[PDB]
Amino acid sequence: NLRTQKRLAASVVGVGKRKVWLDPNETSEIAQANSRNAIRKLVKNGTIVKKAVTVHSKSRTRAHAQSKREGRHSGYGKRKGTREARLPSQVVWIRRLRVLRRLLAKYRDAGKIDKHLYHVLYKESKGNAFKHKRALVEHII
Amino acid sequence: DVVTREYTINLHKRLHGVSFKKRAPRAVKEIKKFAKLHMGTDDVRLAPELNQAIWKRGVKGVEYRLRLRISRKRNEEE
Amino acid sequence: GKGTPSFGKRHNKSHTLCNRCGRRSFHVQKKTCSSCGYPAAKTRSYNWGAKA
RNA sequence: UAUGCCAGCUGGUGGAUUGCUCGGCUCAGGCGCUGAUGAAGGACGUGCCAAGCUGCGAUAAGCCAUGGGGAGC
RNA sequence: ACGUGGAAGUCUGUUAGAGUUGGUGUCCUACAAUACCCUCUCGUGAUCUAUGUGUAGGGGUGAAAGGCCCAUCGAGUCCGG
RNA sequence: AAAAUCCUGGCCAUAGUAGCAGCGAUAGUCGGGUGAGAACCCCGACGGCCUAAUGGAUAAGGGUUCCUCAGCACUGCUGAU
RNA sequence: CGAGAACCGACACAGGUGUCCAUGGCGGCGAAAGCCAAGGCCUGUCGGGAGCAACCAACGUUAGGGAAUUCGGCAAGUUAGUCCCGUACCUUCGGAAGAAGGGAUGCCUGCUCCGGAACGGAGCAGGUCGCAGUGACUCGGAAGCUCGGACUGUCUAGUAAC
RNA sequence: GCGUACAAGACGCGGUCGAUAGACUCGGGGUGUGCGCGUCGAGGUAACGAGACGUUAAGCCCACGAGCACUAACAGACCAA
């Protein structure tokens, strides 16, 4: 039939071949096509128009995205993967112990800590003695 | 003339046929022959209209019992 | 070995037409032949067959 | 008396048979080298439409001269 | 004690890819002159793979079974004797 | 020649029989178009299948299978516009 | 064209055949499953009919018993993800080990902690539904004695993988 | 139009002088109380909040029975001494 028309149609349409309308009941026109100009004319007289592309579901992902990624819909009995592979170490570990090191380099730099007490904290933070910077500060006193 | 009658279409869909193949095609067949041997006509176009309705969901899922409108004219049998 | 395929899959060119011998005959992994001539500048024969 | 057996008849299928011979097989007489002046050989081309073969070679199933031949090609 | 780190013919894994244990299932005038399905082994390594290239028949190639060298192998195939 | 699992061709029974189901891809249905003819050619709707592939781009290899028009004797596991 | 019809396999052959797209969404450890886009398809190309029997291929569920079956538990089933607790003999001190065994797991409301932050991770309190919360899917049954070869690896392309 | 029957075929029942099948309603059954909203709820400024109770013998569902001609058993064909 008008498979060929289908060849054009989606082309000068700019859609896929699958999504290209047909009238139907306008198979006389479209049929007698046979020219790219012809098909994009009949396009104008909407007999030739296609669409109905699918859209993302957003149903499974949405509310779930805003729940998990926040505390919820997690726990033990959801998460697969080991303890690592979600909330890794050797990552978080450089989240602190990186900031910390810094704020014992801007101190004793700043001059606030002499050089016997920046040394001490120094390798006493790169040795799990600290919690967060604030914890660090508190012990700093 | 115009009459309303309920189409019963379990007898085919889910009754037989393939659940995950047809349902939709089965439904049309059944419908085509209750409107027919009712009217006494060979067959009616019957669509589109109750064809989206018939398959307005997946092929598999089918709606049981669609009511319809009917019209026939005296000429070539409609 | 036996066609499986295990053979036939081989998609390599070989044994194309030789310049002077119409037959394809000439391999590409070889130098020239499998029909008359090349390397010998004569004609190719061989008595592996015809009695002389 | 279906299903069916045996023989024939009409028609078919098939291509035997008979007849026919543009092909073979064999013997005999004569004759007998070609090529770098490219056989030689091969490649690729070349036709209105051209795949094969043949012929040709970018002047390409051909060009010229003489002679023969003859109303067709 | 805490950190440092990440090694490995290392582990799990139908990631890709490779292999081929059992079912002695299906098939067995096949889809197939070695196939289909479930199961199963390996999966950074002596790993897997494309293309190119080398070694030729009493010769090659062989982590060796007499395995493989185009469905041909305790001596390939073709033709000749 | 009656004979050689004899050679070549033709032909009967077998049989209107087996196969055209089996595979993690079970796929169509209702209207309509064209046509001498439509279950499978095309339009729409509804229903589905494929997600490292039944999607996109390519190597080798094939070699015109590409596009158009006209067709159905051949080929297409049925039919065919 | 590049392939369940354009390649090799005598065929429109369920076989074989290299590269790049590995960053589409939810999911989750994930290039996994499952579902869905974009894109492709209804050509892994014969149909129609019978509640559609026997018999066969794949497969589901079977009370009570629980390997009595059988050469042999072959086949099928069981377990299963993640976190916490805990873990024997032996040992080349590496391992054995996920030994074993026991507990937890959903949803909702409000929060704390780590981090610059994530639509990252780890916890807390309270409320609450089901027979069942890794609710599908994905996902080990475990233990002991003996023989052999130390191990990873190789092998009869096509009945042998030891 | 259906089964007290059944692989094809066969068999049996009913066909408006009708309860044969479906729909609907009820009876009889299976699960185990629905959506929504209201109160409570460890807490949290709050946002928010697993869950509890009430509404609710709920909700959802049925291959059985009855009532009921609403729908469909129409129309009509053929064979026969």
Tab-separated table of C-alpha atoms (C1' of nucleotides) in Angstrom, chain E:
chain	number	residue	atom	x	y	z
E	1	A	C1'	44.905	-0.063	69.569
E	2	C	C1'	43.908	2.904	65.484
E	3	G	C1'	45.266	4.228	60.721
E	4	U	C1'	47.890	3.417	56.305
E	5	G	C1'	47.154	0.744	52.077
E	6	G	C1'	45.741	-2.513	48.572
E	7	A	C1'	48.525	-7.570	47.089
E	8	A	C1'	46.497	-12.196	44.727
E	9	G	C1'	47.733	-17.825	38.149
E	10	U	C1'	42.591	-15.127	45.567
E	11	C	C1'	36.992	-15.467	46.468
E	12	U	C1'	31.303	-14.529	44.883
E	13	G	C1'	29.310	-13.372	40.337
E	14	U	C1'	24.709	-16.167	33.288
E	15	U	C1'	28.939	-8.026	33.611
E	16	A	C1'	31.207	-9.030	28.879
E	17	G	C1'	33.660	-13.236	27.393
E	18	A	C1'	35.461	-18.334	27.790
E	19	G	C1'	34.465	-23.530	29.066
E	20	U	C1'	31.184	-27.841	28.914
E	21	U	C1'	29.694	-31.618	34.591
E	22	G	C1'	24.818	-33.911	35.155
E	23	G	C1'	19.974	-34.431	33.135
E	24	U	C1'	22.410	-40.258	30.174
E	25	G	C1'	15.967	-34.864	29.445
E	26	U	C1'	14.276	-32.638	24.031
E	27	C	C1'	15.936	-33.930	19.125
E	28	C	C1'	17.831	-38.487	16.798
E	29	U	C1'	14.491	-39.185	7.847
E	30	A	C1'	16.849	-32.982	13.357
E	31	C	C1'	16.462	-26.257	13.252
E	32	A	C1'	21.517	-28.855	13.381
E	33	A	C1'	26.339	-34.566	9.291
E	34	U	C1'	27.601	-32.550	16.994
E	35	A	C1'	21.477	-28.638	17.644
E	36	C	C1'	17.894	-26.905	21.957
E	37	C	C1'	16.774	-26.231	27.323
E	38	C	C1'	17.687	-26.534	32.613
E	39	U	C1'	22.193	-27.495	35.627
E	40	C	C1'	27.185	-26.672	36.054
E	41	U	C1'	33.071	-24.576	35.733
E	42	C	C1'	36.359	-20.187	34.776
E	43	G	C1'	35.886	-15.102	34.697
E	44	U	C1'	43.582	-9.852	36.165
E	45	G	C1'	45.148	-14.300	34.213
E	46	A	C1'	49.827	-20.092	32.077
E	47	U	C1'	43.110	-15.364	30.615
E	48	C	C1'	39.841	-14.461	26.391
E	49	U	C1'	39.498	-12.538	21.352
E	50	A	C1'	39.797	-9.986	15.882
E	51	U	C1'	42.977	-9.314	11.910
E	52	G	C1'	47.876	-10.052	9.980
E	53	U	C1'	51.762	-13.705	9.820
E	54	G	C1'	55.058	-18.504	10.299
E	55	U	C1'	55.582	-24.164	10.505
E	56	A	C1'	53.280	-29.161	5.443
E	57	G	C1'	52.426	-34.947	5.103
E	58	G	C1'	56.635	-40.008	7.578
E	59	G	C1'	56.409	-33.757	7.722
E	60	G	C1'	54.318	-30.165	11.011
E	61	U	C1'	51.802	-28.836	15.630
E	62	G	C1'	50.777	-31.315	20.306
E	63	A	C1'	50.486	-28.614	29.081
E	64	A	C1'	50.722	-35.970	25.283
E	65	A	C1'	44.555	-37.812	23.769
E	66	G	C1'	47.804	-41.014	18.931
E	67	G	C1'	45.008	-35.087	19.878
E	68	C	C1'	44.902	-31.579	15.634
E	69	C	C1'	46.672	-30.072	10.321
E	70	C	C1'	39.168	-27.140	6.174
E	71	A	C1'	32.702	-32.787	8.193
E	72	U	C1'	39.281	-36.425	6.062
E	73	C	C1'	44.309	-38.602	10.603
E	74	G	C1'	48.022	-45.028	14.196
E	75	A	C1'	50.196	-40.850	8.595
E	76	G	C1'	45.702	-34.999	5.075
E	77	U	C1'	43.573	-34.133	0.352
E	78	C	C1'	43.929	-34.302	-5.133
E	79	C	C1'	45.347	-36.561	-9.423
E	80	G	C1'	48.476	-40.152	-11.437
E	81	G	C1'	50.965	-45.160	-11.244
